[PDB]
Design a protein around this ligand. Structure first.
Ligand SMILES: N[C@@H](Cc1ccccc1)C(=O)O
Length: 345
């Protein structure tokens, strides 16, 4: 019979663009696996849920998935939506592989039914710090975040890395997501002579901050995590995007092995360049690999199978640890441009 797979992330709300990547990836993976035969003849059927990357809606989606009888979830997208959902999946015996959530705590609580194909901010944070310390070498640093699990997690991790090396972090502060007016913060960066800012959060805020910064003449170097590194960033920020630093996964679209899938997305006129197309595609491949190899429909048998034997995916040969995290997932540093391109820093 058909095998239902829930796919969960933002299809509404302020970061729906990251969701667009996720769904585009999941859909192409499901199509490709079904075109190749399915799972010994059984077709994968994607069942899509919008959690708006909102913790309360995520919980409602998780409860709906349980009620719907679905046993496998590729989701959720954001850390603060994925973690409360994971509590329900774990309790109910449902497999959950997140292609998006990077915050460490998800997989540090002993859970057995949870995995990711996303990286960890316990790696992303230190990488930013190292680059800041060793290459940027700033004089006066401010660290800003959006008071949310992902962004504040990362802002804390970078502060910790920088303060370990006695760097001059002048202040640490939160802003409210959705904020369109950064004139107060920007005046502070100017008056306090801040030449470097790290912002833990997502592109809508980062873009507005960059545009407003350059409009008053601030020359401050900004940096953020992969959450800011979107085609939207440069549209929102304008020429102010130029020079922004971002940590991001490898450019899987440039791997020659993916040229066929790149072409598939291109024939649909979908953008293939975002890392999360591939990271989601790889979660679907992972689940499919487990289903094919085990012949089991048990979530825990599928998770045991991936942790023992791995999967070959569009983001490379995958190996997971006993907590459900990928070994060897690294983030690189990139320099953004007004036209939305980016170069290795
Ligand atoms: N990694 C982010 C979500 C994210 C998904 C896709 C791209 C960028 C960011 C988090 O844990 O919330």
């Amino acid at each position: 019979d058909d095998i239902k797979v829930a796919v969960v992330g933002a299809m509404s709300g302020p970061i729906a663009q990251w969701g667009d990547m996720e769904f585009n990836g999941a859909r192409q993976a499901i199509k490709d696996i079904n075109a190749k035969g399915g799972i010994k003849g059984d077709k994968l059927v994607g069942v899509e849920y919008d959690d708006a990357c909102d913790p309360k809606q995520a919980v409602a989606v998780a409860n709906k998935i349980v009620n719907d009888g679905i046993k496998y979830v590729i989701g959720h997208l954001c850390s603060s939506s994925t973690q409360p959902a994971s509590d329900i999946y774990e309790d109910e015996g449902i497999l959950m592989i997140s292609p998006g959530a990077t915050n460490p705590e998800l997989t540090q609580r002993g859970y057995q039914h949870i995995m990711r194909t996303a990286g960890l901010d316990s790696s992303q944070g230190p990488t930013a710090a190292k680059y800041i310390l060793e290459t940027v070498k700033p004089q006066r640093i401010a660290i800003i975040h959006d008071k949310q699990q992902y962004g504040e997690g990362l802002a804390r991790s970078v502060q910790d890395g920088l303060k370990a090396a006695n760097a001059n972090v002048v202040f640490f502060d939160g802003i409210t997501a959705g904020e369109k007016d950064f004139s107060a913060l920007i005046a502070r960066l100017k008056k306090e002579n801040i030449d470097f800012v790290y912002y833990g959060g997502y592109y809508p805020e980062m873009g507005q901050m960059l545009r407003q910064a350059r409009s008053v003449g601030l020359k401050t170097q900004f940096m953020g995590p992969e959450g800011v590194g979107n085609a939207s960033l440069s549209n929102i920020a304008g020429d102010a995007a130029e020079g922004m630093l971002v940590t991001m996964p490898k450019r899987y679209d440039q791997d020659p092995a993916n040229q066929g899938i790149v072409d598939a997305l291109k024939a649909d006129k979908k953008d293939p360049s975002g890392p999360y197309v591939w990271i989601t595609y790889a979660a679907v491949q992972s689940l499919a690999t487990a289903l094919e190899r085990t012949g089991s429909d048990e979530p825990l048998a599928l998770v045991k199978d991936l942790k023992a034997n791995g999967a070959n995916t569009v983001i490379g040969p995958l190996n997971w640890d006993e907590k459900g995290d990928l070994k060897g997932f690294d983030f690189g540093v990139f320099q953004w441009h007004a036209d939305g391109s980016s170069t290795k820093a």
